[PDB]
Design a protein around this ligand. Structure first.
Ligand code: GNP
Ligand code: CA
Ligand code: CA
Ligand code: MG
Ligand code: MG
Length: 166
């Protein structure tokens, strides 16, 4: 069947793991255990197509930045995650986009910009600001909460649909 290689990237603590685990395992991870690099695989039906999602859950802790080139090489689509209550994490997105862009040598890499933790009220990144960033990359912006499940399937499925447009 069709395999889609997704890679989840973004600053430490933005909820990359919580998002992936919510998608794959249907529960919310409340505790914070920084990730080195984990893999998840699951067969799902997306728009009538039975396919395999191979998802790489990457490290946001900057001390592991050396591992980025490797995973950006293999991945087919990238979920670029920031947290809506973390302005620095939003600012950090460009550095992830730029590296993906360099590694793929393409201004046309399947990506989705994700504003996570939308269940929290301490918002410092307004939807419109993120929409604008995404528009500049030519990609969708989707808000999510790994806690409530809001937008979680939408984000990952949209990334699959972006890979399909390429
Ligand atoms: N309220 C709320 N908390 C969230 C959400 N997503 C993640 N968190 C919380 O934020 C913390 C960090 O989540 P985690 O998924 O570990 O982040 P990460 O981006 O994978 N970190 P790392 O880059 O170090 O691997 C955890 O306490 C988790 O419960 C969300 O949507 N809402
Ligand atoms: Ca829990
Ligand atoms: Ca682009
Ligand atoms: Mg993690
Ligand atoms: Mg502001």
């Amino acid at each position: 069947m069709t395999e889609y290689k997704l890679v989840v990237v973004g600053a430490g603590g933005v909820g990359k793991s919580a998002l992936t685990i919510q998608l794959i395992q249907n529960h919310f991870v409340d505790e914070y255990d920084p990730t080195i690099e984990d893999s998840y695989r699951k067969q799902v039906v997306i728009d009538g197509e039975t396919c395999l999602l191979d998802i790489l859950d990457t490290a946001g802790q900057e001390e592991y930045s050396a591992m980025r080139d490797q995973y950006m090489r293999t991945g087919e689509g990238f979920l670029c995650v920031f947290a809506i209550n973390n302005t620095k994490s939003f600012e950090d997105i460009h550095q992830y986009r730029e590296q993906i862009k360099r590694v793929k040598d393409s201004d046309d890499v399947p990506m989705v910009l994700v504003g996570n933790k939308c269940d929290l009220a301490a918002r410092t990144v307004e939807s419109r600001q993120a929409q604008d960033l995404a528009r500049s990359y030519g990609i969708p912006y989707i808000e999510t909460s790994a806690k409530t499940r809001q937008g979680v399937e939408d984000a990952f499925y949209t990334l699959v649909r972006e890979i399909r447009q390429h």
